[PDB]
Design an enzyme around this catalytic site. Sequence first.
Site, short mmCIF file in Angstrom:
data_model
loop_
_atom_site.label_atom_id
_atom_site.label_comp_id
_atom_site.label_asym_id
_atom_site.label_seq_id
_atom_site.Cartn_x
_atom_site.Cartn_y
_atom_site.Cartn_z
N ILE A 12 0.86 -1.26 -0.01
CA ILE A 12 0.01 -0.16 -0.06
C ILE A 12 0.76 1.26 0.15
O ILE A 12 0.71 2.00 -0.93
CB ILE A 12 -1.01 -0.03 1.26
CG1 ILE A 12 -1.80 -1.27 1.01
CG2 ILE A 12 -1.62 1.40 1.19
CD1 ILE A 12 -3.03 -1.36 1.98
N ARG A 22 -3.87 -0.11 11.07
CA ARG A 22 -4.30 -0.77 12.21
C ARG A 22 -4.40 0.50 13.23
O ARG A 22 -3.60 1.44 13.65
CB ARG A 22 -3.24 -1.63 12.74
CG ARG A 22 -2.94 -3.00 12.08
CD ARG A 22 -4.18 -3.86 12.10
NE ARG A 22 -4.46 -4.48 13.63
CZ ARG A 22 -3.80 -5.59 13.89
NH1 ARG A 22 -3.15 -6.16 13.15
NH2 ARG A 22 -4.10 -6.02 15.06
N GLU A 34 -12.13 -0.62 17.78
CA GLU A 34 -12.98 -0.66 16.91
C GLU A 34 -13.92 -1.83 16.70
O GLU A 34 -15.12 -1.83 16.16
CB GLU A 34 -12.35 -0.55 15.42
CG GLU A 34 -12.02 -1.72 14.89
CD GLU A 34 -11.33 -1.50 13.50
OE1 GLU A 34 -10.43 -1.02 13.43
OE2 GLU A 34 -11.69 -2.31 12.49
N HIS A 40 -13.36 1.45 8.86
CA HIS A 40 -12.59 0.28 8.17
C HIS A 40 -13.02 0.04 6.69
O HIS A 40 -13.29 -1.22 6.73
CB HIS A 40 -12.42 -0.78 9.34
CG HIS A 40 -11.22 -1.79 8.81
ND1 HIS A 40 -10.84 -2.39 9.63
CD2 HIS A 40 -10.76 -1.89 7.62
CE1 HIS A 40 -9.67 -3.28 9.05
NE2 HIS A 40 -9.83 -3.07 7.88
N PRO A 74 2.31 -2.84 9.31
CA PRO A 74 1.56 -3.49 10.40
C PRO A 74 1.46 -3.10 11.81
O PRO A 74 2.44 -2.26 12.29
CB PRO A 74 1.96 -4.88 9.85
CG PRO A 74 3.60 -4.79 9.80
CD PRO A 74 3.66 -3.53 9.11
N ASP A 105 -9.16 5.52 9.34
CA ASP A 105 -10.00 4.40 8.80
C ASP A 105 -10.34 3.10 9.89
O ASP A 105 -10.78 2.25 9.40
CB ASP A 105 -9.67 3.79 7.36
CG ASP A 105 -10.55 2.99 6.72
OD1 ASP A 105 -12.06 3.13 6.79
OD2 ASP A 105 -10.03 2.02 6.18
N1 LIG Z 1 -9.40 -1.70 4.75
C1 LIG Z 1 -8.13 -1.43 5.27
O1 LIG Z 1 -8.14 -0.41 6.14
C2 LIG Z 1 -6.92 -1.94 5.23
C3 LIG Z 1 -6.73 -3.02 3.99
C4 LIG Z 1 -5.53 -3.85 3.73
C5 LIG Z 1 -4.36 -3.39 4.52
N2 LIG Z 1 -4.40 -2.50 5.65
C6 LIG Z 1 -3.23 -2.19 6.74
O2 LIG Z 1 -2.26 -1.80 5.99
C7 LIG Z 1 -1.13 -2.21 6.63
C8 LIG Z 1 0.01 -2.52 5.76
O3 LIG Z 1 -0.38 -2.93 4.62
P1 LIG Z 1 0.55 -3.67 3.57
O4 LIG Z 1 -0.53 -4.70 2.54
O5 LIG Z 1 1.03 -2.46 2.54
O6 LIG Z 1 1.72 -4.31 4.11
P2 LIG Z 1 3.19 -4.69 3.82
O7 LIG Z 1 3.78 -6.08 4.21
O8 LIG Z 1 3.36 -4.81 2.13
O9 LIG Z 1 4.00 -3.52 4.16
C9 LIG Z 1 4.30 -3.33 5.64
C10 LIG Z 1 5.70 -2.46 5.63
O10 LIG Z 1 5.89 -2.15 6.85
C11 LIG Z 1 7.45 -1.78 6.78
N3 LIG Z 1 8.08 -1.28 8.11
C12 LIG Z 1 8.94 -0.28 8.27
N4 LIG Z 1 9.19 -0.22 9.45
C13 LIG Z 1 8.43 -1.08 10.33
C14 LIG Z 1 8.51 -1.48 11.76
N5 LIG Z 1 9.27 -0.72 12.60
N6 LIG Z 1 7.73 -2.53 11.99
C15 LIG Z 1 7.01 -3.40 11.13
N7 LIG Z 1 7.02 -2.97 9.59
C16 LIG Z 1 7.70 -1.87 9.15
C17 LIG Z 1 7.90 -3.01 6.41
O11 LIG Z 1 9.39 -3.37 6.00
C18 LIG Z 1 6.94 -3.25 5.31
O12 LIG Z 1 7.52 -3.15 4.15
C19 LIG Z 1 -1.43 -3.60 7.28
O13 LIG Z 1 -1.06 -3.74 8.66
C20 LIG Z 1 -2.83 -3.57 7.12
O14 LIG Z 1 -3.41 -4.21 8.57
C21 LIG Z 1 -5.76 -1.82 6.30
#
Ligand SMILES: NC(=O)c1ccc[n+]([C@@H]2O[C@H](COP(=O)([O-])OP(=O)(O)OC[C@H]3O[C@@H](n4cnc5c(N)ncnc54)[C@H](O)[C@@H]3O)[C@@H](O)[C@H]2O)c1
Length: 336
Positions: free
Chosen positions: A156, A237, A266, A298, A209, A261
Amino acid sequence: ADMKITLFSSKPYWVKWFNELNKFSYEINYVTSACDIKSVNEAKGSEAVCCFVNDDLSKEVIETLHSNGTKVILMRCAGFNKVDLDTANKLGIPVLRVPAYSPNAVSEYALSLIMALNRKTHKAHDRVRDANFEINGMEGFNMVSKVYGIVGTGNIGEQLCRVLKLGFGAKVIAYDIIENKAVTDIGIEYVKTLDEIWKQCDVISLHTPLNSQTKYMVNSESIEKMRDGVMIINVSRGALVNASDAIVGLKSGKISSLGMDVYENETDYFYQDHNGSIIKDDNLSLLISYPNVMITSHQAWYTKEAISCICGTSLQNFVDFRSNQIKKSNLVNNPI
Ligand SMILES: NC(=O)c1ccc[n+]([C@@H]2O[C@H](COP(=O)([O-])OP(=O)(O)OC[C@H]3O[C@@H](n4cnc5c(N)ncnc54)[C@H](O)[C@@H]3O)[C@@H](O)[C@H]2O)c1
């Protein structure tokens, strides 16, 4: 039994899509209620159960589910923070998620929140509806005049980076523990410490995350270190933000706006209509009432492409389960 799905946390959009895409003669029992211990009986005699982000797949319910004939759990979402995998593994139950719904949906929603707190079109819309055409208070900013910082250059994050740096020519900084190449390849710079993100960025969007490191990323310590007038977006989150700290930030003026969101507590609210009942969560009640705060239930993921993929994939997961052809990418746990 053999072809029956009990789908918890049902809503009309779930029914509409799961039917449209059910090409495999599956019998779907849609349960409005969520999967908790009071509800898990409704799955009795259902080989498969389908759950969502806020269902309670805890040790006891899983045991009941297995002790009542269900053999595969279908997560119609990519997350599973609320599924006791160990109980599932020991009982030989696969949990199968949808790892890849359109991330552009979440990134473009994050943009939506930015635009909204910027140009205040909702405020405009609420005023005009009351026959008030005064625009005092709705001064916005040109997008290029602010420095956007992205925390989490993942799937994202990367997209939000492109649309900004590419669509507006804005100055964009990233902080990540890794370093997505696609981000460095369009001249976006990484900073080694989050302390730099605060010092330099005017609007911050969080795309990591939730884990023991990222939790309460935004707090008093970091809020103080931030610029004045900072905008904060968080569609990841809810617990990346300590809400009561965030309120202090908003009250004192340090934080200009807040878009979320998602929210720490929640689970007891989102997706459900609770009008006419007092929200007892005071932080959530306050945030909702503040006029520079966007809180939504959300829904960043809810586009036609994302929900089509989500439903179609869960159904497909069921057929894979039954032809003993589970896709490695969709199996979260490891059952016996
Ligand atoms: N409808 C919604 O609101 C919705 C939908 C999809 C995902 N999300 C949230 O978006 C978040 C990320 O989404 P994504 O698909 O891009 O995940 P992703 O695995 O593609 O990216 C997560 C990134 O966080 C980076 N990062 C940098 N510093 C960090 C740290 N100190 N600790 C942990 N990670 C670190 C990591 O290297 C990693 O690249 C998810 O936690 C997910 O819960 C929300």
